[PDB]
């Protein structure tokens, strides 16, 4: 049973890498195994060094393939994706299918987090629902992928020292034990700890503030310093805003923005970047251009 | 274990410019009347005069955060001596 599913899933990886969509029953089985493998995973999953952390993909599949050509193939280099790989891109189902199949194939080598775009309402309004209707035909595969987004872990921890999440901090979160105590098994609300986890963003302020997004908050250097000191952390990695250079060290070498989708929405022209934590926590930046088409 | 006699001893030490012993016996009287400060000290032992004398004893021993905390204790908070 393990051998036949392993070789079938490897053929699924090979068929995904050449940009071919799967079938509905194959997505059914992939999503069911993904549900089984993601049930036994905490809100703060400890990812051991080394790991190559990548940021937002947002359904740019050829850019994802280039990313695998830069940082290394998925069997050989560890990856940690901070969500938001589903909307604002032409090839959306292939990207999420490749990530989920790589997760269920390599359970210690691919870590997948949850973004704010990976919810029912946002996928319904910003494009994944339409892509679902135009390729697979009905809205049922969107139902499996929304449940799969529902089970995804929120944050991740690298060697007890680097905190990786999609959005930003929270006025209601003070310790990492509160992250592990949240009920993750629900769609992201309009108010609460987890909406702020997936929606907040840093800014050069002196305190909290209403984010110009309709949800989440915004935080400054004092808040980030307090969170890093009170939790034994030294770095907060996140991927929520478009960056030209692909990386930002804001809040005085404490908060790191890593955007990994070059030419966002195919009209912005940003040079994306990813971070490569070695076995000595001894990092480097891989900065790349969009793929030829 | 008689609080009034301890207050008298503390006042005699305070009059003879022995601030450490006066503070010791004031604290000792507070520990007699309340069960080692488990309940609140009654106002007939730590009067405003007694707390003010304790504040003066802390001030002349160059312990100023203790002066601020100890002058929160009064019925009206003495902000001038705190500052």
């Amino acid at each position: 049973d393990e051998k036949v599913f392993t070789k079938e899933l490897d053929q699924w990886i090979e068929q995904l890498n050449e940009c071919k969509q799967l079938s509905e029953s194959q997505v059914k089985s992939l999503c069911e195994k993904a549900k089984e493998i993601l049930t036994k995973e905490s809100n703060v999953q400890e990812v051991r060094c080394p790991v190559t952390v990548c940021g937002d993909v947002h359904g740019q599949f050829h850019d994802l393939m280039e990313l695998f050509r830069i940082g290394g193939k998925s069997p050989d280099t560890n990856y940690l994706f901070m969500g938001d790989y589903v909307d604002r891109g032409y090839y959306s189902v292939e990207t999420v299918t490749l990530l989920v199949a790589l997760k269920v194939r390599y359970r210690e080598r691919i870590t997948i987090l949850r973004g704010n775009h990976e919810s029912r309402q946002i996928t319904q309004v910003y494009g994944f629902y339409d892509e679902c209707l135009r390729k697979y035909g009905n809205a049922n595969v969107w139902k499996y992928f929304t449940d799969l987004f529902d089970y995804l872990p929120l944050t991740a921890l690298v060697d007890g020292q680097i905190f990786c999440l999609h959005g930003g901090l929270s006025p209601s979160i003070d310790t990492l034990d509160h992250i592990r105590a949240l009920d993750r098994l629900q769609e992201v609300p309009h108010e609460g700890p987890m909406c702020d986890l997936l929606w907040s963003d840093p800014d050069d302020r002196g305190g909290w503030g209403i984010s110009p997004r309709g949800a989440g908050y915004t935080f400054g250097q004092d808040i980030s310093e307090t969170f890093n000191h009170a939790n034994g952390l030294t770095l907060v990695s996140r991927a929520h805003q478009l960056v030209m250079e692909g990386y930002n060290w804001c809040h005085d070498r404490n908060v790191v923005t890593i955007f990994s989708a070059p030419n966002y929405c195919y009209r912005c022209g940003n040079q994306a970047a990813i971070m490569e934590l070695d076995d000595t926590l001894k990092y480097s930046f891989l900065q790349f251009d969009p793929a030829p088409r | 274990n008689n609080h009034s006699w301890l207050i008298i001893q503390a006042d005699i030490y305070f009059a003879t410019n022995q601030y450490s012993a006066a503070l010791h016996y004031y604290l000792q009287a507070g520990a007699v009347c309340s069960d080692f400060f488990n309940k609140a000290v009654p106002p007939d032992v730590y009067t405003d005069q007694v707390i003010k004398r304790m504040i003066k004893c802390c001030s002349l021993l160059n312990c100023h955060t203790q002066v601020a905390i100890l002058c929160q204790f009064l019925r009206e908070i003495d902000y001038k001596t705190a500052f």
Binding site: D203, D204, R205, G206, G209 | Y79, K80, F83
Partner: protein, 74 residues
């Protein structure tokens, strides 16, 4: 930018701040000659202004002690 970069690390000195705000506004008022002294009071010469003090209601504090009643400096 100056709104989002405020740090609350001072005393509750309401009178001096209120006098400073009024001094700014009345300063430009008397610069422009909006108020014609001696020639009457013309309410058509008008510079509409609303000032909003957002505070907490704590005790009024100076460097010497707490002040019970609010007096503007003269």
């Amino acid at each position: 930018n100056e709104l989002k970069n405020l740090q609350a690390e001072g005393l509750t000195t309401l009178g001096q701040s209120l006098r400073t705000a009024f001094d700014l506004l009345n300063l430009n008022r008397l610069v422009t000659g909006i108020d014609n002294y001696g020639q009457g009071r013309n309410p058509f010469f008008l510079e509409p202004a609303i000032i909003i003090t957002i505070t907490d209601g704590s005790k009024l504090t100076t460097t010497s002690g707490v002040q019970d009643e609010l007096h503007l400096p003269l």
